[PDB]
């Protein structure tokens, strides 16, 4: 599996990809069909932030017509990272920040509670979106972070 | 309900709410019992990031031994930001922070597709972690993130 | 509705459209005339900063001779910040960016003082610029900022 | 009247004046009875940012205990700034940041196109914030920020 | 009069400007004659930091050679800011930018000393910059910044 | 003469000055009588960014109550600059920050047109402020540089 | 264990360790005798990088006297981040700073093509130091990193 | 030897050598062959972050179609450095990045103990990656820093 | 002589004098011989932070193949500053940036000891390298530094 | 020989000695006499930034009246950098960080030209000041920094 080490060609298929997606007026879930994966897993690819295996990168290229050096480019592993100067200033990205610049410290405080000195991995990790009633009306989301715990210990 | 504008007499407190927790070989589970609140939100306000209601207040002080000053600094509306700078170098808090840069933009993109224009809540907003077993061997870390959404709508 | 995580496609866009603006010396009042939306938000929709309704997108697209691709992206949420850098040097700017610089803290102890835990929000949110004359004279300008109180509960 | 150019002093001053506020439970309302001004400034003063008025100081200081060094402190002007830093992480503060970021350009669009070139004043200026109920429940800030025109014209 | 919020066009036609003038080996002094404005405040147009009058844009065109497409642009109102970044490596730029680094702290105690609380305005403001001999031989430059006081009262 | 390489000795003589004047109600400009130097070189040593000579230093600890420790470091050249950070918060220096922001490509420019290349110096250098009238009402600040013309030659 | 999300604490007991050690003339090697326990593990915990299990808490104690507050806060698990501001400017630590700058895009490039997309871990990591000699006269460091490959799995 | 001070033109190379090996699918393993030289060093080169010899370099242009000016500027000594900004986002160059953030004093620490005052050159100065088991199963990364101890001397 | 204020088209020039030297194999010494210019002036200039006299202009232009466009431009007076950013990481420049970076405050301490106030001009300067034999084997450069002392008097 | 890995207790030396410099008035050349080292080492070491052998430490501590916990911290090697956050306000400093923002790029230019590829080292180096009359009136200081050549060869 190919890799890149800088982030512009991926960027500039992720826009080829969203310039598609827009004129033929589609959803991230219908793109996702018959990929065989998860849906954040592939609309964080298409976003540049993830290789996607040949047969899933196909199944996408087939609805947004792109080419064959567009189908390689999607099966590379990118340059990671996909907020710029790492401070957001869009509100919808700026709040998923913000609940780490304020529950940062909790959360260090109860994993080494909970599971010892370590981490919780965003490598060995899965992340999944869900929209859920609210039952004061209106809707909420719950987002799942799920990462394996890997210690720290003395050696 | 009283604030501060300004965080050193909060850092004050939480240092003093620590050495004493360290002292006494004590768990935030254990600190917490009896406040009638869940251990994410009392842990977070022990560490200075949220006011708790008196009732908790003199729940945890008589756990830490804390006195009627630092009773009633504990029940004001900090200045909040667990993060100095805002960018974390501790490991366990970085790599928290590395999932928001790398699925930002993915987060942004689902919750417009299932949503609509606006953001999901860091206000009206509910945080817990739980420890579930690998199958493979080792621990998970569930985080839950769980946030009203908030239209965007024009006027 | 469509979303897009990067800038550069609506700033290609506000850069034609201001051009256009420019070389048929309009105004934005004049360009607004039958979206029945407010001023403020299709401006700011303008300058890149917030997606149109398909019925204002077709107003202000013919108005400015935009084509059909256009209108598309006319329609699309953006990612917000009309700022580079964060930090404003441009004076007009500058003065506002001054204003929550010097009364951030003043603003921060009378919502918790008059209101209570929380915030104010930016998204349950209406802004209009209003001119009125100043009696010693000249002019004065009248910014409205109007936003819900969401409060911070325990949970 | 005398100045400063640096702020701890000031800092230490208003660190002071809080414990004293939220020892004694008092609010601002409260402590501002009889000072003779508004609410906001004689907060962003009592907050570090605007001297006071020899007879409203003394006022203030009746109530919060404060010595004749304190009094003579609080008349200076200070060296202002309530945000250290420039970029606040307290999400109370952050959406008032957040506006400024969103409609910058909106308001320097506007500006110049409804009074011509040069800025909206911070200085000969006034703001103040009145709490209005939302006709879908709930309640709202309704915050104005209201300066003088100050034309750029060539020289 | 028209504005822009983003520096770009305005920085082709400031390139464009330049271009010309130093291929007909022009002085501002020269490309000035005829404005009936000052020296400065065009010498800034031209750079992209003020708009010109129309006349004066002409005038200033014709010298230059260039189209109604850059007449129209020079008379809109730029985003203002000569040094990307705010702070200057040219050694020229940087002097000016170390004269207020030093004396900043001095230029606030004396205004507050001599005016009274609020600011000298950087708008109600000319500048210029005279040419005089040294007595030991060799030049100074004597340059004036003459910007209106406009007082902070209590409100 | 003696030198300092960091700014915290000089700081605190700094607070020790003004504490002393705010106490006494003084003027910098009747701290500066008799001193034989210009207001605004003295206003800045006190502020620790000149040292005196010897006499002066004298002359103005004598009105302040220092010491000879203080009168010593008075005479100390420091580790100059103002504005901690370099960027500043406040209106009052902000606003003559801002005037090397919009002008300073504009001072490059004329300062090679009318001298030459190279700099104007910020050493070979004096600053002054005067108040003048302003016609049309109120009053104004008229701030003199009044640096020598430092030529960049082959070599 | 404990653990705390902030570094003052650590960073007061790391000063008293080292003003120990330095009194004592001692060595890292001779202070770890009979941890049983790594050299740079050990080193990095009385650094303040790690906690140290009770024992070898104790023995390390022993060797430098410090209390029992000491050897519990020693067991404690610190905030991590051993550069302040993450930029190094002692030359010793830039080097290995620079090493990562100049070959941090080898590095990905190799464990991509050799391993796969994922990561090598940080925390199921351990590194040493040797010193070996130089065949050209000298010495040489050989700096081992031996960190576990964690797989990115698409999901 | 040629060299360059900005890195476009080598950041242009590389996106075009890059491109050949992503549409040959190429490994660097397999474009090192012949070369002469290691695996990390000729990577390095072809990520733009050293000269090759002209033999070398001719080689790895055979296998990737590199005319005579690629060959030439593939021999030009650049200028180094692969993380703009310094700080990277991307998990795999990161962790690296944490290494040293994490390790930083302890190899100061070290450094000094076993060698003396002094460096670790980063330029007499070999890397490299190995791949080995891990007992545990799965697979490790062993990184090798080599560099020359250069002793600190009183002069 | 001409200037200009932004360094676009003067780092295009020097992309184009690189490429000349670079597919001409010429080295600074051969291209400089007969401008009757020292070395490190002439390289300064045609690394774009310089304007030459227009007969050392013409004889580099000469042996490069640049027309009289770039002659004219070569002339100019350009924003200087050779660091984009202001921080290299380029491990050649970095080392002089380190050099300053370490001997800072001792070149402060000494030129106040043995010149006085004041600063040593890095305008009325001159730079030269001189390559030395080591005696212990190798080569060392001799970088020299050459200012005027400009004195800071009281005014 | 023992070290820190930070530098607040030798900044509280480093004050110890300036404070004591300066009430005897002695100079680093007075401080210097009978070390046996250059004065530029020891003014460095004085200044925190080298450790000083037992035998100078000794001396220069007779005439400082430093205590034994004195001389014991001046032998350790310390946290090297002598411009907090690298980027220096201070004029006497600023010059010597502006000739390498100025000629950073000629100087790696002319090192790869003379030298070849690799660095000019900071660590096998020396630096001298030396005042020299300037023959057109006044003084000069003559810097010469004298660095190691080291290679990078290809491996």
């Known amino acids: 599996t190919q890799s890149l080490h800088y982030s512009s060609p991926r960027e500039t298929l992720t826009d080829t990809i969203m310039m598609a997606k827009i004129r033929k007026n589609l959803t991230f879930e219908a793109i996702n069909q018959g990929t065989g994966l998860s849906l954040a897993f592939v609309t964080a690819a298409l ?3 993830h290789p996607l295996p040949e047969q899933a990168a ?3 290229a087939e609805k947004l ?10 099966q590379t592993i990118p340059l990671r990272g996909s907020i710029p100067g790492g401070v957001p200033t ?8 913000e609940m ?23 490598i060995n990790f899965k992340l ?3 929209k ?4 004061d009306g209106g809707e909420r989301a719950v ?7 890997l210690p720290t210990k003395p050696f």
């Open 65 to 74: 017509d792109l080419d064959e050096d567009a189908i390689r480019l999607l």
């Open 47 to 49: 976003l540049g932030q």
């Open 143 to 149: 987002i799942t972070l799920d990462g394996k715990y």
């Open 128 to 130: 999944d979106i869900k």
């Open 90 to 97: 869009d509100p919808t990205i700026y709040r998923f920040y």
């Open 100 to 122: 780490v610049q304020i529950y940062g410290s909790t959360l260090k405080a109860l994993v080494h509670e909970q599971f010892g000195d370590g981490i919780i991995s965003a």
């Open 58 to 60: 196909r199944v996408v």
């Open 132 to 135: 859920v009633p609210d039952p």
